[PDB]
Design a protein around this ligand. Sequence first.
Ligand SMILES: *[C@@H]1O[C@H](CO)[C@@H](O[C@@H]2O[C@H](CO)[C@@H](O)[C@H](O)[C@H]2NC(C)=O)[C@H](O)[C@H]1NC(C)=O
Ligand SMILES: *[C@@H]1O[C@H](CO)[C@@H](O)[C@H](O)[C@H]1NC(C)=O
Ligand SMILES: [Ca+2]
Ligand SMILES: [Ca+2]
Length: 534
Amino acid sequence: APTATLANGDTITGLNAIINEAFLGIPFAEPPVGNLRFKDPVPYSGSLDGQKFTSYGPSCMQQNPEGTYEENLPKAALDLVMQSKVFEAVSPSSEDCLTINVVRPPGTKAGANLPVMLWIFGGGFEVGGTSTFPPAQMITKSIAMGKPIIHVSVNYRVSSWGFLAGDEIKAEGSANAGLKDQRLGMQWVADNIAAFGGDPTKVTIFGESAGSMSVMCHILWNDGDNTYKGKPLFRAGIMQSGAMVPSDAVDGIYGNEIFDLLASNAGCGSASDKLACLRGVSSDTLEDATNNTPGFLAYSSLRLSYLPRPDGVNITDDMYALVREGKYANIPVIIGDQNDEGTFFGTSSLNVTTDAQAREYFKQSFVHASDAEIDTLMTAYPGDITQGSPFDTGILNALTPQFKRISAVLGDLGFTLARRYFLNHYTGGTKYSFLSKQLSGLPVLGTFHSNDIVFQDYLLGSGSLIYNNAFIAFATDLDPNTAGLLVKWPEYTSSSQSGNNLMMINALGLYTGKDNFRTAGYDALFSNPPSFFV
Ligand SMILES: *[C@@H]1O[C@H](CO)[C@@H](O[C@@H]2O[C@H](CO)[C@@H](O)[C@H](O)[C@H]2NC(C)=O)[C@H](O)[C@H]1NC(C)=O
Ligand SMILES: *[C@@H]1O[C@H](CO)[C@@H](O)[C@H](O)[C@H]1NC(C)=O
Ligand SMILES: [Ca+2]
Ligand SMILES: [Ca+2]
């Protein structure tokens, strides 16, 4: 019943879900299989005329979060689950996975010109799919608000399939394939969304964790030039936990190590051209080899095996420098964090129990940091258990004497203080920032990483006022304050500014605060950002 005629003349059919109309699994690129592996996506040439798009397609190949070259129980367990026929059935994945989904309010028609919210999922650049992020909650609230929006989500290649690095990848011009996938989908939106009822000039991009850092990368892409056919691809951005990626160049030390490890695992250790060898192995073999390189939950933790890296061509340099140098798109942005971003990742190093062990874990993780920098970091983030994350929990949550400490560091460097650095240097447009403490009191994890996804797509809570309401108002009017919340959200200018600059959330609701916590950590970390790159 729901119908749309694309830019090339094809007329497709969608599904009518009563509370919304959806067009799921629309292919936007040729399958990145065979020799197309690790390469830039090719725009989809083909006819969709007369086809129905009523279910999400498979996700791209997934990496075992507990993967590693070592052997252990968590690895063995997840693998057991991931290779199970019930899992293969409920959550299918494939290399042919580049599809896009368009969900809109019931009755939307071409020409409606509704603002568009483009969702980029986050799964540590190693797992993820669009099907696990139900848009219904957002769509319904927007209708109730009298501010209807269209929800679009794009699949992108993750892990080795989409973020392989090293000398060979660089020489070929194939760096950051997963990000290029997202870019192509954006171009697809520009060219086709009007047929669905969306306004291509009113696109807001947003994501959480890896999806949020993806949004940052898009603001920095092509030195800030975000146009396609003479027009900007998006007019605003919403970053839920995640800003710049602290990573070395694509042909740096770790990018090359991972490439070589993967090549050995796949049986390409002897190839004169390892890259062509990798395009030749079966997907089973490639999946196998990849699961034998560290996943984000393994001991390596946030020193990721696969993630966006400056290539000198589309991301021209160190991302912190691009932000200092003004090489970004000039757009209004909302960027925020969960109080305790690092607790879930801190669970990966629970065998680290003494200060000497913590120092070695940090040294091993930050190869560019000197001893003095490591010492400064360990002074800024002391052993004192009352000082770590879950923040403000006193002597509680002492899984080990270092857990709270390691959680404070990972959460700050990867997300929370990284955000402050961006905000203190970005002048491209109005800035709004939030900090959630909605789950204060939750044992072990606190207001943990990704809990926002629950209150944005699954359950209603005080946080939904921001994750749905405020975000809908921003995508519609470029000002979250049009949502009619009782607490006015103040513009953020600087972390040293006078007055409250953060929208805050607790179990009861909203209130405002200041972005002046852990200044000692900010300086330990960001005095010379590249000392802590991976
Ligand atoms: C905590 O566990 C990790 C994970 O096994 C240990 O690191 C590994 O140690 C083995 C055995 O020596 C090495 O072959 C691996 O290369 C290490 N893995 C990584 C990812 O580095 C680590 O030594 C343990 N830490 C403590 C403090 O005991
Ligand atoms: C990457 O950069 C090159 C060099 O400017 C440019 O021609 C190319 O169009 C860019 N790719 C994308 C996806 O923007
Ligand atoms: Ca090499
Ligand atoms: Ca500029």
